[PDB]
Amino acid sequence: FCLTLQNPLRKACISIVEWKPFETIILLTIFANCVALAVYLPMPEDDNNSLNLGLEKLEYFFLTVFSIEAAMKIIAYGFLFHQDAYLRSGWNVLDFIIVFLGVFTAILVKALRAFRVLRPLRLVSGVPSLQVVLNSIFKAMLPLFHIALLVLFMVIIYAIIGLELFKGKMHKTCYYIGTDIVATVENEKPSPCARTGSGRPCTINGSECRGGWPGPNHGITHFDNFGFSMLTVYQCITMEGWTDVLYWVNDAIGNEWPWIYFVTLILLGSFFILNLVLGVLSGEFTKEREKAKSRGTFQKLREKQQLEEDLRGYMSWITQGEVMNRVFRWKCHDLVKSRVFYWLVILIVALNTLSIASEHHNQPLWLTHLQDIANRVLLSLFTIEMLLKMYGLGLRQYFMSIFNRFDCFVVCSGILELLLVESGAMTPLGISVLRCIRLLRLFKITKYWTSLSNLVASLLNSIRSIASLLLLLFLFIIIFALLGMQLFGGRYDFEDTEVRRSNFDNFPQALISVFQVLTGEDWNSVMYNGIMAYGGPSYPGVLVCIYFIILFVCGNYILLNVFLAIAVDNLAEAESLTSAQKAKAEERKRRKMVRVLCHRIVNATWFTNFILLFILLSSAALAAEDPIRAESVRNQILGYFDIAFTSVFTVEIVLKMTTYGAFLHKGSFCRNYFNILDLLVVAVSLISMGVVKILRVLRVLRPLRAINRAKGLKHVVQCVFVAIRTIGNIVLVTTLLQFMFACIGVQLFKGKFFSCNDLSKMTEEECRGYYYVYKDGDPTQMELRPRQWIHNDFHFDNVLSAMMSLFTVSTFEGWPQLLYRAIDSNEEDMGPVYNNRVEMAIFFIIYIILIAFFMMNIFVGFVIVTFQEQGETEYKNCELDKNQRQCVQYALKARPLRCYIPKNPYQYQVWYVVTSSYFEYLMFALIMLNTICLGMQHYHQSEEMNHISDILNVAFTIIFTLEMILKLLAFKARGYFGDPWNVFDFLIVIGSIIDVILSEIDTFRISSAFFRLFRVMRLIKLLSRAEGVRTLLWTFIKSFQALPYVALLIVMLFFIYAVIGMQMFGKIALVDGTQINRNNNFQTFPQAVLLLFRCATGEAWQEILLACSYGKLCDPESDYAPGEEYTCGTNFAYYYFISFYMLCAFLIINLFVAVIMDNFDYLTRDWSILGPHHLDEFKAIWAEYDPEAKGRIKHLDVVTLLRRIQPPLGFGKFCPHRVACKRLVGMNMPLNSDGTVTFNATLFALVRTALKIKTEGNFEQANEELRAIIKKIWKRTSMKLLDQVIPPIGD
Template sequence: ERVEYLFLIIFTVEAFLKVIAYGLLFHPNAYLRNGWNLLDFIIVVVGLFSAILEQATKADGGNSIGGKGAGFDVKALRAFRVLRPLRLVSGVPSLQVVLNSIIKAMVPLLHIALLVLFVIIIYAIIGLELFMGKMHKTCYHVQGGLMDTPAEDDPSPCAPQSAHGRQCQNGTECKAGWEGPKHGITNFDNFAFAMLTVFQCITMEGWTDVLYWMQDAMGYELPWVYFVSLVIFGSFFVLNLVLGVLSGEFSKEREKAKARGDFQKLREKQQLEEDLKGYLDWITQAEDIDPENEDEGMDEEKPRNMSMPTSETESVNTDNVPGADIEGENCGSLSEKNFSFSNFSSRYWRRWNRFCRRKCRAAVKSNVFYWLVIFLVFLNTLTIASEHYNQPDWLTEVQDTANKVLLALFTAEMLLKMYSLGLQAYFVSLFNRFDCFIVCGGILETILVETKIMSPLGISVLRCVRLLRIFKITRYWNSLSNLVASLLNSVRSIASLLLLLFLFIIIFSLLGMQLFGGKFNFDEMQTRRSTFDNFPQSLLTVFQILTGEDWNSVMYDGIMAYGGPSFPGMLVCIYFIILFICGNYILLNVFLAIAVDNLADAESLTSAQKEEEEEKERKKLARTASPEKKQEIEKTAVEEETKEEKIELKSITADGESPPATKINVDDYQPNENEEKSPYPTTEAPAEEDEEEPEMPVGPRPRPMSELHLKEKAVPMPDASAFFIFSPNNRFRVHCHRIVNDNIFTNLILFFILLSSISLAAEDPVRHLSFRNQILGNADYVFTSIFTLEIILKMTAYGAFLHKGSFCRNYFNILDLLVVSVSLISFGIQSSAINVVKILRVLRVLRPLRAINRAKGLKHVVQCVFVAIRTIGNIVIVTTLLQFMFACIGVQLFKGKLYSCTDSSKQTAAECRGYYITYKDGEVNQPMIQPRSWENSKFDFDNVLTAMMALFTVSTFEGWPELLYRSIDSHMEDVGPIYNHRVEISIFFIIYIIIIAFFMMNIFVGFVIVTFQEQGEQEYKNCELDKNQRQCVEYALKARPLRRYIPKNQYQYKVWYVVNSTYFEYLMFVLILLNTICLAMQHYGQSCMFKEAMNILNMLFTGLFTVEMVLKLIAFKPK
């Protein structure tokens, strides 16, 4: 408490001094005009206010009877102290960038929040209508003393005999009276419960349980449509808009901060230049004023300079100095000899040192040394990776020796580099700094392990990062190094975000402790791990909710701690919803925003480097080429430029975007006009008429929309023959080309693909010879025939595969051919017993993929995915390496430590034998005898491969708290768990989740986003206009004048006037709102009278909306 008061005094003094320095409020740049200062001021004022109130309360408490404080309860105000860490924001600029981008995004995020709320309200009302009261029926015993308790250990909803759904078995009956799953919290009994259940489904945590409960209660027909549409629309679509908003705002804020920094640097530079100019002017003026003194000064300086020694080895001559005797002379000559000898030896040493350093530098920079170090790193990696549980003693000895030898070698390498390059040059390289850190860490770890202060941590595994240097010799090095550089550049933003995340977690942990501390013990038979009983545990629980794993179970425990699903208990869900939205949807999406921003930087850097290299190559060629060749190169360069200009011009004019105000030959438009008439080449091409066409001036006025939407260009027929018999001019081939390029033919094939996909889905997999399967089999013959005919026509039109532009030169066409060939082969071999036929029939599921080649948008998406997969290799390499490193550390920490006995009272495998007694639900009357068994965790760290698998499951967030708490309880090898034995181990999992799951996994998503953006921009590569200009031009061209319909009939006009008035709109809005409230008022167990009243109100609203429809029909006419 005293320390608390000390800090409060310091912060108060700081605020007071700042107010005196900057002024309080009423002028620009005053203390309270800055938002962060205002935050500091509020925190200090609240702290002072709570301290004064606390003292006053204590004084009142002392005076009151029994000593109990009768004053104001300051606990809520004291909770404000948790905001004090936010004062860090005012001192960290990069943290301000992250916070500012989140604050700026609040307005668009509010719009998204309203949209999400709208979706939740609609689905909650639909859920009320469909599922109200369906969760309260389960199976009960028909007779005996257990008629009031559910028949199953884990009850689940059921359906009556007459209805679809889960039927009760073994003498049990489906009856109402059960509270419902999850203590009756998850249901659609009233609007509040329905909204909570819908929100839980949108977060995709536990939504499948709700779906299956509904299917048990109602059957399979309806619930899946409701829940699948909710997840697709609510979760996949609407909530991902949050990412788009945050990404845009972060990018803008970073650009602003960068521009601000550049402007500051420019101002400083200008200031320096002005100062320097001032000094130069002053010096020149001084020189102009006093030229004589300058000459005198120079004359005076000459003899002084003459008397000084001219080199290091030359000593000052004292022979001519008056008063120097013979002894002095002798002493002088002796000292001269000694000095010259020492100088000679030091010079010799320097020369020898320089020679050694030169040789060492050459050795260090040689390829042999490079590969030797890489080989040693590889050996080090193998040594670490070979460690596993129950390994033989000789292997342990070999590993220990190898680790020490390798550590010595890497230390020698570091010292050699430091000596050869010099400390300053050594520490310039980031890799060298990293090496130094690992070597020092390894030495420290070895000393601590040898002195038995700590167990090995595996710090040397970090050396594996050096394996990335192998890629230096590959062509991927540039893009990989740019990726790593962009990741390192984002470290500052990531560090600020982590700091913000940490502050956020601390605030909610402290608040959670205030609300739920010691209250999760309502079930005596079950020990809960995700609690708020102490600060470390509270931090872990909040972090778990942030990752989204099992957050709904923690919320259910919170509700039960406050008395279950009734009035006070249900208010608890507000804490969890705010925590989940702010943490999971806002803060964690900023990780992705940062990743996208930095990946875009890395990509642009790589492309810039490629262009630079191409330019260098071109210059090199031009330098080395002969004069004739030079001219040729220059000519081709000029041709390329003019070609690019033409392409730009064509793309601008053909797309209907701002054409330049110059005269363009109509030839540029000719292909488009031909396309409009006929997409097929004709034999009589009127070349002479083209030349006689007059020049057409193109002004800034846009052309009509009909000219803008040009027909998509048909794929031209190749010049080569098809099947060696059909020439390009063959009528049959031309006719085939015309058919396959016809829109009707393409749409028809798409329709047949859709039908064949539906027929595949409709097959009965159990009864192969059923009537339905026979009909579908005949339909399959028809579809395969149509698809075969399509491929024959296309091969006739384009040729098979020998020439460029032929059918099989396109990957999508090869996919088509594969699918059709599979169908034909499976028809040829009828016996379904042959495994090959089964596989071939399974391959028919690829048939829907044939739609890709025929839908342009879908084709673009697939191409982007393939481009992303092709270029995503760098990220896979970095992520796999990080995963491997964490797995090695995990093996060091947890190998053989995750075993436990089913009887928790036994701690070793030797003790864990025989049988033990357990009691069902803590009832002493229901004992059960079970065998003891010594079992390992489902996911373990016994070797590197299983450790990588375990960590991969952690990175998906699915079930990771179970592994976390198992690891926290781990004690020693082959010894059972001890409750909360090593809480500090959770740091390993938290760091792993932050680096891999929050950041590296988001890099994958970011890479796909960046690829999509680049591919989208690809078609405008040669266009001079930027994206915003193109959008502006497109908007201007597509703009249409608004037409307002006004009826001529005077009675109709009166109705139209009323319908169009603002008052009418407001009235209808109020009616819709009242109708929504009316629908939301329904609840389970409502009285008959209430139900009747609701029915009457609904009928009244339906009547009013019918009147509105009739009035609008009269006003606007049906068409």
């Protein structure tokens, strides 16, 4: 609006604005101002040191500047040029700080101090090219509100189910006798208890359950109170702390009857990324081929690279030629390029690796000097192959290879370190850094890997992009970190003895803590401490939980757009790899220029299922077992079966054996079928005639052979078995980087991580005897323990031991239990110091982002492979690339719709109401009232609220019944039971009326809880009418039908890994709080799956590996008769869980990449040419004018149909005056009887408008040419009506 438009010398200030140096000034204005928020040190109960006093006055200086800068621009530009959001928001920052002065000096407010955190966002308006990069994001999130609207409706479903079934179970105590102490055991979180049957016993020797609140963390996960069940469901979906909830419910109610609930939560919580991994990959793959393929920048980019090879290629010959005079100088390529050095320098490097894969923290006397002679020996030889490479190769070309540009910097770092320590006059800090520089010599293997030669190009393409991307990420962290220092301000005081250690009470402490929430590790402890800090779970205090939701949702998604741009890069790395395998092959193309009866047994269906069942019964015999009884009846009945199940299997072997002779063993499958029975022989023989475990383990090899006819190996993982030699490099790439950072870890963290149990002694000699453990910090409640070194169980001593610990960080699990332990390292063998050495955190964060960058890579390799599997059948196309193939699928196949209209005009008057949508909104309303009728159930409430609560549940049940009645009156059940949505509510209605009657009988009990779910289920009627999201699920329902056998692989893991673990990891006595207990048990089978299922979402498998080592108590009902008491646990747990987390997580990605193979077609539908809704719409127009289901429309009403479709597919608004007639004149429309034309002829004529055409002669040849294409696509030779459809569509 540009207020009052005055010229005279404002123009000077206008010309002042257009000067370039405002980039030079004001960029440094922000960057100074963020440092002004860095060292702002918050102090808890109104305290200021000196620096906070000063910079409050310096906050006046920063407010002084922008108050000059902005109102000058209104005089410069005015309000027609503040239409910029970056000018619209920038001012909103400036406006509030001036208001903050006005309030601060009128009183001479607190929340008025935290709006000033937004000042880093002034960088965006200043710095160019970032305004694009944010708009990479906000135009990528918009294809997700059909996916985010699912979880929000799925939470509202899973919150109300929890609030009905679990209302107020968490309240009973485990207190002592008459006092007010909760009774726990040293490590245990105080779990609920119950004094009736079927739950906890509460056997802590001197206790009794009562009322009150011992419930979870500090009051946070009641299943009271709608507003809280929305929290704990949201805690479980992101999969960090859900098994804590399940142990709270199972200890409160009883097991075997909630685990149904939480598993269906996570299988629709693990399903949900499989929406959104591919939901975000949709537009990404689209933008890679609908921005740049519409542009053609890729040919421009690979041309300049092709010239870059010609520049480097032909310059070297000029470089070689003009200088070239010795009997040597050809002894170069005699030696250097020869095959001898390629198998000789590798030896020294592999010796320079095993010069480092020493380093104990003890190193007795040998390796102390043997590594010192190695730096003299191995560096010498290495120098030789430099100096031969320097002189007799060519000096300029040796500095032309980047890979040999690295070798000088090694051999510079080889000698200059070496000549320094000959002096010695230096700090032992300094020589400690120099030993870290010796780990550059591992990077000689990075010049290997031919696979890296595009993985180098994976990086060097994107440095223009991702460094602008990781500027935006590091911005997003510093925004939320400085917000955290104001919302939480070091309010973590508490007055207790527990170390709530992830406080925000610094800047770089807040930075590390904030990062933890992004990785999703342990953000309970962060959040639980946030809400406990303010007052309690309350009305004001609990609302700050949305700082940690928004940090976890908005934070995670921009991390996903980082992923997004990386997948584009390997697609460019695909094309530089694929097209190079054309052009490299084409250069050589220029350089080319009654045993017979037993076969009836092996074929029979009387034999086919009969060997399936004895697998399925041999499975179940392995399923339910004793394994800690040693003599019981279970062992002896099930012992009888598997000997007999060998016997039926034995005839299966012999009847197979007489079929084929010497050429029977040509199958490796056939070799596998035989060695099982051989092992079985001695399994059965040694028992019946007097370590015998291996005979029992290998019975589960029999259920392997079930997938004999399953091609889910032969299609899906065979596609990965193509890329398994590509990912055989890629997994061995990261394992090299898990190797090399282990050696950086060992050079830093030897001997440390070594902590006493009495935290004040720090040293070996000074830490024994006894000491005083205070239960809660009253200095009277004083207890004893012996003290000793707790060597902290994931230690960095040997490089074997290191990689087992960098693995736990790589699964993002317990890295804060390791980082906070890692900071406290002290001298070589000394206990921890509280916040010594804060700088060691940069080691884990660079390590994290490194592997978490690499993680994304492993996933990107998959999706590229998947697309290129679909292409191989599409290369005999001759079509519009699946656009025309869609129209082949639609214009041929699709019949009419169902379209029911009655007679008997009493019945019609019902029918006129039903399809008329005046009451479709009404059921929409009364569902939403039955949300809040179920969404106000507080706890303890009253008898006022109860009397309302029964009455409405009766009244709503009547209305849906009268709905059901009137729908049944018009649509008599042949009509009514056509739609499954009509069927499903009929399941609800009877299920609701029993909920009315069972409520009468208790007015006069488990289904009094259990049938209450039927009020919840009627919310799912909402998805009947939300078209945007109904087809999205429909797509993935159509998917999981198509891939059963891949999901049948993962359950072969759980089945096999349990029965292995069930016979090894029994006998492991179930002491509470030691992470293997009554709820995390190995003993029965079904426990086993949940413990395995706890690993698959990664809920702290860190701990449970440590609970099976060698020193666990042996469950005092089993064995071990004197003395040998603690010896039931083996070191095979290491190779168990580690291989389990690999082969599980891996197999699940093979599931998630497999769902691409169906639904890529859905993900990249052009919503600007012709999608499915249009072709879905056309089926519904027949439901208007052809309600007799004839499949034929008269020629007259064609015209009124073509005006009413929609313009983008049908005809526009200016209609028609010839055009929507002349188009039909310009097409193939036959006439059948009277005047009635079929649908498919009308369907095909309109669809040729979109999939464009030519005139007759070209159409008449197309009537064979599409008939040439479709007869191929008609895989069945039958159906001459399809050819009859082909002439009638051609007519």
